[PDB]
């Protein structure tokens, strides 16, 4: 008997809280409305780039201009829910690409921008904290990464321009 059902049953006046049929019926109405309440509450939980799978991800792609169609082949995340073609993205990869894309949408050519959001902060929490951007000499943008990301992915992002990049970019291994 969760919060919603309990607080609503108080609107049953006390002639009818205890008669079993009446209480069951009021609980029926409250329950049917309660599934909507739960849906509204869990929309946030189940919508964002993290807890999103399948179509919502695709929706996010089309809101951040990144379809699961990268036309490239990446090896499989062999650690069922959904399968795509080989030349598309399994969900988790496409999730975290969409995170990177969301970052690069709000980029800026500053590594510690105090007024606007920097490049460094947004690329760093793009990768959830496994990236590190330091500039170069001929406007190189050296980029350290944790070893928990295969070279295939990052070389693909650089080869599709999804990482944040003002004019020039590169990586490091």
């Amino acid at each position: 008997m969760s919060d919603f059902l309990n607080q609503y049953l108080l609107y049953l006046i006390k002639q009818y809280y205890e008669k079993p049929k009446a209480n069951a019926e009021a609980q029926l109405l409250i329950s049917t409305w309660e599934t909507y309440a739960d849906f509204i509450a869990n929309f946030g939980n189940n919508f964002d780039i993290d807890n999103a799978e399948g179509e919502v991800l695709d929706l996010i792609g089309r809101i951040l201009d990144l379809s699961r169609q990268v036309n490239d082949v990446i090896p499989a995340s062999f650690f069922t829910s959904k399968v795509y073609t080989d030349y598309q993205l399994t969900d988790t990869q496409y999730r975290k690409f969409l995170k990177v894309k969301a970052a690069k949408n709000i980029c800026s050519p500053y590594l510690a921008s105090d007024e606007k959001i920097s490049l460094q902060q947004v690329v760093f929490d793009a990768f959830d904290g496994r990236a590190y951007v330091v500039d170069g000499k001929d406007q190189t943008l050296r980029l350290y990464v944790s070893p928990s990301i295969d070279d295939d992915e990052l070389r693909l992002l650089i080869n599709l321009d999804i990482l944040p990049r003002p004019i020039t970019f590169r990586y490091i291994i």
């Binding site: 309990n6 049953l9 108080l10 049953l12 006390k14 809280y17």
Partner: protein, 497 residues
């Protein structure tokens, strides 16, 4: 810097008003944990949750019970009442060895100092550990402004012991513990004006001289009947136990409740909703132990008693109709959920329930045993007639002569008390339904029917000369009829189809 403060100071109240359990609402909670209330400290008096905490800690269950006590909105301290924590020896109290003490007379600090400041030289004879008699022949008390200073002087004077002052008392404790007699009550010295008698330490003076008890002493493990020790010290009028009274001991305490003109509240769990003889609560009901109030809590939530106690003893017995029933009154504990069969059994056995209707407390009280209203109110009435007769025998400078005008005095005072408790809502006029009386049945029944109470005192010439020179007043017989309160309503609709 001459501050404003020396023409006005404004601070926060510090001591808990330091009152004593005089009225009816002096309710108790009996612990069994020898944390701070050891023997000879059998009780402590409180009027706020925080003080109980500071002596007991918000962690110990005793502070928890105090918290659920004071949280009742019309709690006892709102009608001239106190909470008191008792102590029954649950298991093998170890009383640490003490040192001999010497508590002096209550000195007002407005008279001790003016008398001291004239006493140039000092003069004491004290003895510690029965050693050589020590005589103190120089105490320049001239420069003293408060008892703390004379305390310091005595501390510097009495070798082998420490002197402290505390609430106008002078305590003197030897350092050594165990067979450490302070033989002296500050006897007269050979020379120097005597400070001993004026202080109050003097042997003829009313100075307590508890000798140093022997080394560590083990009191045994008492029984819950050790409540008597609390009752013989506090004049508690309603008590509970933190630990649940064993079945085998319920009748005893139950009898106790009647014999000491008090109430005892005890809660039982679901397994006691029967009416067999073996069920202790029904044994109480058959035995007539109407003062041993039984309460019901499905979970076993003991605190239900305290709040219940904290809800009952809450009537200022001086305003009009302040006598309250119990049913449907807000408590400080979450109600429980009961079936209809079990709630009916509780009604018909004597238990009491704080049951949910809808997130809203409903206290339902039984009448199997006499209603808590009736028992508590009758206790208040016996206590109040006792108090008024005592105050009459105390007030007068003369002796209240053993003449018929004297009996009319006493009977009028008793009638005044009865009239107060009819104006108080407890007793109301009605047709006396019982089949017994005191004097003229017509006189008796008419007085009950028109005033609500009757007070007849037998004349002097109707007592033996053995009961005449015993300076005992004749038997005073008073009869009352409880007011007719209502608890339910069976509204019957007159059918016309």
């Amino acid at each position: 810097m001459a501050s404003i403060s020396e023409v006005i100071r404004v601070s926060l109240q510090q001591e808990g008003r330091a009152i004593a359990p005089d009225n009816m609402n002096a309710v108790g909670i009996i612990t069994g944990n020898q944390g701070v209330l050891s023997t000879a400290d059998r009780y402590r008096i409180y009027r706020t949750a925080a003080a109980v905490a500071s002596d007991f800690g918000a962690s110990s269950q005793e502070s928890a019970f105090a918290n659920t006590f004071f949280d009742t909105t019309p709690n006892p301290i709102s009608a001239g009442g106190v909470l008191v924590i008792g102590y029954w020896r649950s298991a093998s109290e170890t009383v640490a060895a003490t040192s001999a003490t010497l508590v002096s007379e209550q000195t007002s600090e407005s008279v001790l100092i003016p008398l001291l400041n004239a006493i140039n030289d000092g003069s004491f004879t004290i003895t510690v550990d029965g050693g050589t008699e020590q005589e103190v022949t120089a105490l320049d008390f001239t420069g003293v402004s408060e008892l703390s200073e004379v305390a310091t002087i005595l501390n510097s004077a009495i070798t082998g012991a420490t002197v402290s002052e505390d609430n106008g008392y002078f305590k003197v404790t030897s350092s050594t513990t165990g067979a450490t007699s302070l033989l002296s009550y500050l006897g007269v010295a050979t020379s120097g004006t005597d400070i001993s008698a004026v202080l109050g330490m003097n042997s003829e003076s009313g100075a307590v001289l508890t000798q140093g008890t022997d080394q560590v002493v083990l009191p045994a493990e008492t029984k819950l009947e050790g409540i008597t020790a609390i009752k013989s010290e506090v004049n508690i009028k309603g008590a509970m136990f933190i630990d649940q009274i064993l079945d085998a001991d319920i009748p005893g305490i139950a009898s106790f409740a009647g014999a000491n003109n008090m109430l005892v509240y005890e809660v039982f769990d679901t397994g006691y909703l029967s009416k067999n003889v073996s069920n202790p609560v029904w044994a109480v009901k058959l035995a007539g132990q109407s003062n041993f109030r039984c309460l019901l809590s499905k979970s076993g939530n003991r605190k239900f008693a305290a709040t219940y106690m904290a809800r009952m003893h809450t009537v200022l017995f001086s305003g009009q109709n302040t006598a309250i029933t119990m049913q449907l009154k807000e408590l400080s504990v979450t109600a429980e959920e009961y079936t209809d069969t079990e709630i009916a059994n509780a009604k018909t056995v004597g238990l009491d329930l704080l049951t949910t209707i809808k997130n809203e407390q409903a206290l339902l009280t039984s009448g199997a045993n006499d209603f808590c209203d009736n028992v508590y109110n009758l206790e208040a009435f016996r206590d109040e007639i006792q108090t008024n007769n005592y105050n009459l025998l105390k007030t007068t400078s003369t002796k209240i002569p053993q003449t018929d005008p004297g009996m009319d005095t006493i009977e009028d005072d008793t009638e005044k008390t009865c009239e107060k408790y009819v104006r108080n809502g407890v007793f109301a006029p009605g047709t006396w339904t019982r089949s017994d009386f005191f004097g003229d049945r017509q006189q008796f029944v008419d007085a009950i029917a028109q005033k609500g109470y009757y007070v007849l005192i037998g004349d002097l010439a109707d007592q033996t000369t053995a009961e005449r020179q015993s300076r005992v007043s004749p038997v005073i017989q008073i009869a009352v009829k409880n007011a007719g309160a209502v608890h339910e309503e069976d509204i019957i609709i007159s059918v016309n189809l």
